[PDB]
Amino acid sequence: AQNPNCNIMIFHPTKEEFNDFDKYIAYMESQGAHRAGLAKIIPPKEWKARETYDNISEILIATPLQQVASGRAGVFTQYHKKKKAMTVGEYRHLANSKKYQTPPHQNFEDLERKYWKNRIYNSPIYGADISGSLFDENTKQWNLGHLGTIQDLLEKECGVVIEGVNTPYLYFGMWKTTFAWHTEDMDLYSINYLHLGEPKTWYVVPPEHGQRLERLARELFPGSSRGCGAFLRHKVALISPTVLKENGIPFNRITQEAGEFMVTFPYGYHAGFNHGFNCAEAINFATPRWIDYGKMASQCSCGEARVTFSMDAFVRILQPERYDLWKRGQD
Ligand SMILES: O=C(O)CNC(=O)C(=O)O
Ligand SMILES: [Mg+2]
Ligand code: NI
Ligand SMILES: [Zn+2]
């Protein structure tokens, strides 16, 4: 079995190997990359996402989210308070202000320590989940707006044509902006490109051990667990590496820098934080290997998780027994 310790693997494809996206994902899996839940892909030196980022300031962040924490430093939830619209140029200025900027630090490890010690005492503002793309249309390789769609994958594998679309999302971050522990909708893959700015630190639980994380979460968030049998779908709970280690949960960590891709694999729980002002682009995707995960994915029906239009068909076709209950939670 390849990668039996479930370590995060880092790949350096050549420009030739960067042509065929599906083929390269399958290669990484042949080497055991999915066992970690997360892989890093450093593009060939010849590649670029676009020519420059000099002209992005007028993008609008219609609903910036202030991420307010409750709990203790290593075990907390966050809620998202909506803020007034602002442009990317306005948000960058805010991220660089004395109130929100990255503190002085020695290295990524020192900054990580500072994040876990102090995150709860601040409320950073995240420009998350903005439909759009920063890839140039002429970028042919690993262009996250030009991937094969999940609807087409399901049709190819299963023969059923379904409605829905699959487009990318932009994320503008600042110091301490946080992504809570989650798997993707329908336990899909994700791919995330860090276009510019400061790093993003990731934590991940191997898919084979995801249920260990879920059991800890139920213990640590006991009211939330009574409310919903899949409350991590709400994407609000944080647990620190120290708490994970104290509770014997297998995990790994890595820091993504600008110009790098990360892939999350089906049922790979992940969480993390941004070091400072940055912009990432991410999208979900599927492969043949996903189908069995999609069929088994948990679902939130309590009403909290509310998701896209396109998840309807995935539930309806892959999980017909669950469909009626899940759709009630959507309405
Ligand atoms: O970058 C973020 O805030 C969160 N991204 C992801 O969870 C992802 O790409 O799957
Ligand atoms: Mg602009
Ligand atoms: Ni994710
Ligand atoms: Zn729920």
From Swiss-Prot:
According to its UniProt record, the EC number is 1.14.11.66
Disulfide cross-links: none
Signal peptide (residue range): none
Q: Name one GO biological process term.
A: chromatin remodeling
Q: Cofactor note from UniProt?
A: Binds 1 Fe(2+) ion per subunit.
Q: What class of enzyme is it?
A: oxidoreductase
Q: Please list the residues that carry the modification PolyADP-ribosyl glutamic acid.
A: 16-17
Q: Where is the JmjN domain?
A: 8-50
Q: How is it modified after translation?
A: Ubiquitinated via 'Lys-63'-linked ubiquitin chains. Deubiquitinated by USP14 with the help of TRIM14 leading to stabilization.
Q: Record's family?
A: Belongs to the JHDM3 histone demethylase family.
> What biological function has been recorded for the protein in this entry?
Histone demethylase that specifically demethylates 'Lys-9' of histone H3, thereby playing a central role in histone code. Does not demethylate histone H3 'Lys-4', H3 'Lys-27', H3 'Lys-36' nor H4 'Lys-20'. Demethylates both di- and trimethylated H3 'Lys-9' residue, while it has no activity on monomethylated residues. Demethylation of Lys residue generates formaldehyde and succinate.
User: Mind telling me what this protein is named?
Assistant: Lysine-specific demethylase 4D
